[PDB]
Symmetry: none
Subunit: 53 residues, 3 copies
């Protein structure tokens, strides 16, 4: 019927979109982690420029 | 034949819309890996001077 | 166009539903460009300050050491 056609169409799209969505979410989390590490480095560099003079 | 055909047409037209998405993602992944390596080297360098 | 007309309507529908993917990718690309710039500035700052710190520490070690000899 129409309700099973939707499920087959949906699963056919998912064969391609699930991996793109997975790749994007893993990039987003790694990029958020890197931004946090870079923020902490800027905080550390700020605390050690007083010792220069 | 009806549904198998429809799925193949739908899949193939989407797959080609994704070709540039896949290229963009692979280029992000390599740049992000390069940035993570540069940030790790900065953390090791900065640990050799962070005590007091 | 029988299946060619169907492919072009499906293609135009799918292209408009992929806009969130394009938006997500655009926003990743700009954030990644911004951190690469922040990472570049940190590398130049560590290059210029660390020879100053190692020398300033050496000079303090000589000054303390030699003031206590004399």
């Amino acid at each position: 019927d129409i309700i099973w056609d939707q499920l087959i169409v949906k699963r056919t799209l998912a064969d391609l979109l699930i991996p793109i969505n997975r790749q994007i979410s893993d990039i987003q989390s790694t990029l958020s982690e890197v931004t946090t590490r870079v923020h902490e480095i800027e905080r550390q560099l700020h605390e050690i420029t007083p010792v220069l003079k």
